[PDB]
Design a protein around this ligand. Sequence first.
Ligand SMILES: [Ca+2]
Length: 334
Amino acid sequence: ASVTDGAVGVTVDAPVSVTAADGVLAAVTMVNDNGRPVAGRLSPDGLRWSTTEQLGYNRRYTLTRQLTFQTSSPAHLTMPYVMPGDGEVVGVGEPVAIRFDENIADRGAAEKAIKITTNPPVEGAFYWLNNREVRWRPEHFWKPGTAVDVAVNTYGVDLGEGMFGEDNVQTHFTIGDEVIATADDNTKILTVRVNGEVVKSMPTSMGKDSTPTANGIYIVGSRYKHIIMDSSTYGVPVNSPNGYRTDVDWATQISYSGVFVHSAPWSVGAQGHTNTSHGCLNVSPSNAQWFYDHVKRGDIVEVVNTVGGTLPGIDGLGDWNIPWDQWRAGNAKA
Ligand SMILES: [Ca+2]
């Protein structure tokens, strides 16, 4: 008796179950609304029947007892979008990210509606970057070869203030080799390591003392063969002292705040010696092209020993700078 006859606002995120005791079944069915299309092909085993098919918004359904009831009529719907993409191979730093097209009032319900399955299994937890986007990651970087399945079962879920999930989404992806590039201001060398071994060293020029490159762990985001770096997009006006408008080749993004690894033919002499940029990691055109071709989304850039502070944990690509105890405690709830 999972629903009462006459009931309204019956939620469609849960199945509709019936149960005996002491007894046996049946003879159980449900119909129909639309439409009249019939039930969820039943189920085993001895003492209980459940829906298979998932129910629509704003329907009557008919279900010894007979039960007629009506499902939720949401005031607002929000669509989730999940990254990374289906079938993608990403680096060891890639969090699962679920972005909604609305601000979510009930973060707890949204987290409960998301099911993440890892093989091999590893513990992880959710943390919100803003009102729209939540991330999930383990305590340490992913083990290479790990397979991940993400089921965002937001359809029928009440997400607070009359807002419901518009659909369910899913992704399955894989973790590739461990790729970690360290930019060390002591040597002005960017070293790329694959599973712990050096495969490439590149002289770099990082942010100058007044606009330094923040230290910390950065996640590789998108890459661009050519792009116009415009400071205004990162809050700083082009005609101001630290402003700029610069055509750049082979640009790999590592922070939403605007740090890239990219081709910097103008600072080749300074690379390895002097920091000249506004925060970017300048390298040679061929080292940048190499980076662009070989480093993938979710790979790691670690910057150490600069005169800067630390990249913010909520940059967008700075997730790994939040200590685990804090990340794990979360910010869905007190
Ligand atoms: Ca909507």
